[PDB]
Design a protein around this ligand. Sequence first.
Ligand SMILES: Nc1ncnc2c1ncn2[C@@H]1O[C@H](COP(=O)(O)OP(=O)(O)O)[C@@H](O)[C@H]1O
Ligand SMILES: [Mg+2]
Lengths: 82, 81
Amino acid sequence: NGKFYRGGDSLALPPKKVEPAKLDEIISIYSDSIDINDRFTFSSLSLNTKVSVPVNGNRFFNKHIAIVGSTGSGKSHTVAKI
Amino acid sequence: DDQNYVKRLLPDTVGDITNLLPSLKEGEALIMGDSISIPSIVKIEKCTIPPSSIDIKYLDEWRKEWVDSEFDKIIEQWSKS
Ligand SMILES: Nc1ncnc2c1ncn2[C@@H]1O[C@H](COP(=O)(O)OP(=O)(O)O)[C@@H](O)[C@H]1O
Ligand SMILES: [Mg+2]
């Protein structure tokens, strides 16, 4: 019913109809686990640009950030955007 | 020791690079960095105004007669250094 619960080894007996996930369920993976006042968005999902990926904005900054990547990958741009 | 030094500080890598470094040919180079997007194996275009090839032809120069080396001017240039 639109709310995502991350679980391990949940069983679906085959055969089950498989379709690509729509916009709202993929949004519910990232948006629902973080309270709305706590969301801090600086990026979106790579294969779905409409899905925004928010991080826990309090927990993003108290616990230190390590931005790592090769030269020319945009690491200074990601630092500047944040 | 050169290869472990180079591969560790090399910013990128290519497929099967451990044995590629000994097997590079004469004038063949591997260029990578942020000035070239794809790490590529290239052949450097032959120098038409070379640093003169200092490789003395050896057998045929041995094959000729026993030449009289002029030791006096060799020693006198050695003397002034
Ligand atoms: N989120 C992004 N979307 C599209 N292009 C980007 C993004 N971030 C960086 N870039 C591009 O990547 C290039 C590399 O710059 P940058 O990441 O700052 O280099 P470095 O990581 O060496 O500091 C930039 O010219 C920028 O245009
Ligand atoms: Mg930079």
